[PDB]
Amino acid sequence: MKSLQALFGGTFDPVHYGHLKKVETLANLIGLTRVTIIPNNVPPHRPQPEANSVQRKHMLELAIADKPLFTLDERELKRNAPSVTAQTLKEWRQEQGPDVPLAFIIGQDSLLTFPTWDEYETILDNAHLIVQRRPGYPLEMAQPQYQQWLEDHLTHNPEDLHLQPAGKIYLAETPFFNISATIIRERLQNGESCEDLLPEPVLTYINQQGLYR
Amino acid sequence: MKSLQALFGGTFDPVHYGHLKKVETLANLIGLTRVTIIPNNVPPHRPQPEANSVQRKHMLELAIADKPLFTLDERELKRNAPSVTAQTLKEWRQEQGPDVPLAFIIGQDSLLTFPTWDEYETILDNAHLIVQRRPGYPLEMAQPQYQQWLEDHLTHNPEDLHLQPAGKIYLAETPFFNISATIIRERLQNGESCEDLLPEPVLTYINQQGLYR
Amino acid sequence: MKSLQALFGGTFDPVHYGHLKKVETLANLIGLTRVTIIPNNVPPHRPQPEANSVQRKHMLELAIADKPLFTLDERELKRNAPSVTAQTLKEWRQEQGPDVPLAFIIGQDSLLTETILDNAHLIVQRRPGYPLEMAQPQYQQWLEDHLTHNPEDLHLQPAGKIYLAETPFFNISATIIRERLQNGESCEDLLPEPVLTYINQQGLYR
Known part of the structure; x- marks a missing residue:
C-alpha cells in the first residue's frame, strides 16, 4: 500500500508546542511519515476563536514551515458549512482511496x-x-x-x-506540557513570558498582530 | 499560575552527563521549563569533595552555559552552615511566595x-x-x-x-547511564577516556585544573 | 571495568533508518556509548543479498559516518567461512579480555x-x-x-x-524498501540520504 497519513484537527488559537511536540513525539514511536493539520472553524453556538481564520493559518504556516513532518490542510477554513469531524474523514477516504491507511x-x-460526535x-x-x-x-x-x-x-x-x-x-503515551490555548492567552493578557510555550515565529506573529491582549 | 520551578541538588564533583541528561529527559516528559541546580557543601562528617567550591561552580557554569533549561544557585556554596535540604526548600518557599509550584x-x-534525611x-x-x-x-x-x-x-x-x-x-521514568562521579574520578586516576560521560568544556576544565589525578 | 560494547549484526541490504533509529533509541535507554555494527555474510542456504559485500559496506559506512555511536566491523565480510553468530562473539571475547561487558x-x-x-x-x-x-x-x-x-x-x-528493550515502530524493512524502489516510489523517509543516493548510483534494487 501507501504510507499511513495521520490527520490532526483542532481549533489552533494559537497553535503551540503542545500541538506540535506531542504529535512529533507520537511520530517517532509510531513511524508517522506524514501528519496533515486540519484547522477547524468553530460552530457559532460555541465561543468563537480570538485570532481570525486567516491569522490562525498564518500562525500555523509559520509554525510548520521548517517541519517536513507537518502539512497544512485548509478545507475547514474555506468551507461554508460548520465543521463536522466525521465529514472531513469521509472526504479524505473519498479522495485518498480505500486502500491508503488513514489515522x-x-x-x-x-x-x-466520543460516541457524542456526529457520526461516531x-x-x-x-x-x-x-x-x-x-x-x-x-x-x-x-x-x-x-x-x-x-x-x-x-x-x-x-x-x-x-x-x-x-x-x-x-x-499512545505522550509527554506532558502544561500548555494550552487557554493557558497561553492568560499569560499574554497578564503579560508573563511565553517563549517556552510557543514557537518563536508564532509568538512574534502574535505580538505583531497584537493578538490576545 | 506561574511556571513550575524544579530544584535539583547534589555535590557535582564533577557535574556529568548523568545529572544533565537525566533531568533534561525529565523536563521533556514533565513539562519542566526551568530547573535550578543547587550544588551543596558536604557536611564535615563525610568525605569532602576533591574539587573545591570554586571549581565545582565553574564546572557547572561551563556545563550549563548553553542550556537555558538549567540555572545555577550558589546558596549552599556561599553558606557558612552545612547544607540541609529542608532548610534550602524552606528558603525557596519563603522567598518565592506561597503560590508558586515547587518540585x-x-x-x-x-x-x-528518605525518612533518614533531616526534616523529611x-x-x-x-x-x-x-x-x-x-x-x-x-x-x-x-x-x-x-x-x-x-x-x-x-x-x-x-x-x-x-x-x-x-x-x-x-x-519519573529516566534513562540509565553507566556514569557517576565516583566512576569518573577512577577513570581519570586510571587515565582512560571520559569524553562520553562529561561535557567537553568540563573535561577540559578538569584537565586544565588537573583534577582527579 | 571497561565500557560496555554492544555488537549489532545483520545483513544490511540496505541499512536503513530502522536499524539505526531503533538502536540509537536503545543506546539512550541503556547507556550505550559504543555500538559496533557487524554486517554478516549470509550462509548459502538462504537467499543471497542483492548488493554485494562491497556495496553493503559502503552503504553502511555512509550511514554511520557522522554518528559517533556506531563503529563498523567487517570481520564477517573478510571471512572466508560463512558467518556463525557465536563465533563472532567468541573472537570478541578473546581479543577483549574476560572483564569487559559485551552485549x-x-x-x-x-x-x-x-x-x-x-x-x-x-x-x-x-x-x-x-x-x-x-x-x-x-x-x-x-x-x-x-x-x-x-x-x-x-x-x-x-x-x-x-x-x-522497548523499541519504536518504523514501517520499514529491507523488503519493504526493495519493492518501493522497483515500484519507483520515494524512500527518503526510510533510508539515509547518503545511502539512498548510493543506491541510485549503483542502480541497486531497481
Missing part, C-alpha cells in the same frame, strides 16, 4: 466523550483513530456499552495502523 | 532512605519531590509504615505538580 | 529461532504488540532465568543476562 489524532478526553460510527469506517493518552487519568468510557466498542477495536500493534486502511484504535 | 528532584535510592516531613510541606526511578528496582520503602506515607502523597498525573503549590510525589 | 543486539523474532551468554549479554529488540512467548517450554525457563530489568547488569557483568 485521526484525538486526545484521551475526546475519546471519553463512520469515523472508524474511514480511518483509524490514534488516542493521545492523558496520563494519570483512568480509561473510563461514558456509557458502559461502548466501553465494549473500545476494546473491540483497540490494538497494541502499531502495524495495524500501517497494514490496514482503518478500523483500529491505538493508545 | 525537588531526587533519585529513587535517595527516597528509599518539612519537604512535602514546601515543595513537590520528583523521584528519578532507578530502573529494575521495586518501590519498596525502608520501614513498611511510611510505605503508607509514600502511597498517600503519590500521584501519576504530572498536572498536580503544575497546578498545586506542593505536597505530591511523582515517579 | 549482542538481535530482534525478537530472530530470537524465536543460543549460546550467547558465555561471552556476552543479549539485548532483544522487542517487537511491540507481540508477547514474550518462547517455542519449546524448556528455554522459556532459560529466558526468565537470565532475564533482567536492571541495565546495570549489562554494564557491571561480562555476560549472563538478557535485556528486553
Whole structure:
C-alpha cells in the first residue's frame, strides 16, 4: 500500500508546542511519515476563536514551515458549512482511496466523550483513530456499552495502523506540557513570558498582530 | 499560575552527563521549563569533595552555559552552615511566595532512605519531590509504615505538580547511564577516556585544573 | 571495568533508518556509548543479498559516518567461512579480555529461532504488540532465568543476562524498501540520504 497519513484537527488559537511536540513525539514511536493539520472553524453556538481564520493559518504556516513532518490542510477554513469531524474523514477516504491507511489524532478526553460526535460510527469506517493518552487519568468510557466498542477495536500493534486502511484504535503515551490555548492567552493578557510555550515565529506573529491582549 | 520551578541538588564533583541528561529527559516528559541546580557543601562528617567550591561552580557554569533549561544557585556554596535540604526548600518557599509550584528532584535510592534525611516531613510541606526511578528496582520503602506515607502523597498525573503549590510525589521514568562521579574520578586516576560521560568544556576544565589525578 | 560494547549484526541490504533509529533509541535507554555494527555474510542456504559485500559496506559506512555511536566491523565480510553468530562473539571475547561487558543486539523474532551468554549479554529488540512467548517450554525457563530489568547488569557483568528493550515502530524493512524502489516510489523517509543516493548510483534494487 501507501504510507499511513495521520490527520490532526483542532481549533489552533494559537497553535503551540503542545500541538506540535506531542504529535512529533507520537511520530517517532509510531513511524508517522506524514501528519496533515486540519484547522477547524468553530460552530457559532460555541465561543468563537480570538485570532481570525486567516491569522490562525498564518500562525500555523509559520509554525510548520521548517517541519517536513507537518502539512497544512485548509478545507475547514474555506468551507461554508460548520465543521463536522466525521465529514472531513469521509472526504479524505473519498479522495485518498480505500486502500491508503488513514489515522485521526484525538486526545484521551475526546475519546471519553466520543460516541457524542456526529457520526461516531463512520469515523472508524474511514480511518483509524490514534488516542493521545492523558496520563494519570483512568480509561473510563461514558456509557458502559461502548466501553465494549473500545476494546473491540483497540490494538497494541502499531502495524495495524500501517497494514490496514482503518478500523483500529491505538493508545499512545505522550509527554506532558502544561500548555494550552487557554493557558497561553492568560499569560499574554497578564503579560508573563511565553517563549517556552510557543514557537518563536508564532509568538512574534502574535505580538505583531497584537493578538490576545 | 506561574511556571513550575524544579530544584535539583547534589555535590557535582564533577557535574556529568548523568545529572544533565537525566533531568533534561525529565523536563521533556514533565513539562519542566526551568530547573535550578543547587550544588551543596558536604557536611564535615563525610568525605569532602576533591574539587573545591570554586571549581565545582565553574564546572557547572561551563556545563550549563548553553542550556537555558538549567540555572545555577550558589546558596549552599556561599553558606557558612552545612547544607540541609529542608532548610534550602524552606528558603525557596519563603522567598518565592506561597503560590508558586515547587518540585525537588531526587533519585529513587535517595527516597528509599528518605525518612533518614533531616526534616523529611518539612519537604512535602514546601515543595513537590520528583523521584528519578532507578530502573529494575521495586518501590519498596525502608520501614513498611511510611510505605503508607509514600502511597498517600503519590500521584501519576504530572498536572498536580503544575497546578498545586506542593505536597505530591511523582515517579519519573529516566534513562540509565553507566556514569557517576565516583566512576569518573577512577577513570581519570586510571587515565582512560571520559569524553562520553562529561561535557567537553568540563573535561577540559578538569584537565586544565588537573583534577582527579 | 571497561565500557560496555554492544555488537549489532545483520545483513544490511540496505541499512536503513530502522536499524539505526531503533538502536540509537536503545543506546539512550541503556547507556550505550559504543555500538559496533557487524554486517554478516549470509550462509548459502538462504537467499543471497542483492548488493554485494562491497556495496553493503559502503552503504553502511555512509550511514554511520557522522554518528559517533556506531563503529563498523567487517570481520564477517573478510571471512572466508560463512558467518556463525557465536563465533563472532567468541573472537570478541578473546581479543577483549574476560572483564569487559559485551552485549549482542538481535530482534525478537530472530530470537524465536543460543549460546550467547558465555561471552556476552543479549539485548532483544522487542517487537511491540507481540508477547514474550518462547517455542519449546524448556528455554522459556532459560529466558526468565537470565532475564533482567536492571541495565546495570549489562554494564557491571561480562555476560549472563538478557535485556528486553522497548523499541519504536518504523514501517520499514529491507523488503519493504526493495519493492518501493522497483515500484519507483520515494524512500527518503526510510533510508539515509547518503545511502539512498548510493543506491541510485549503483542502480541497486531497481
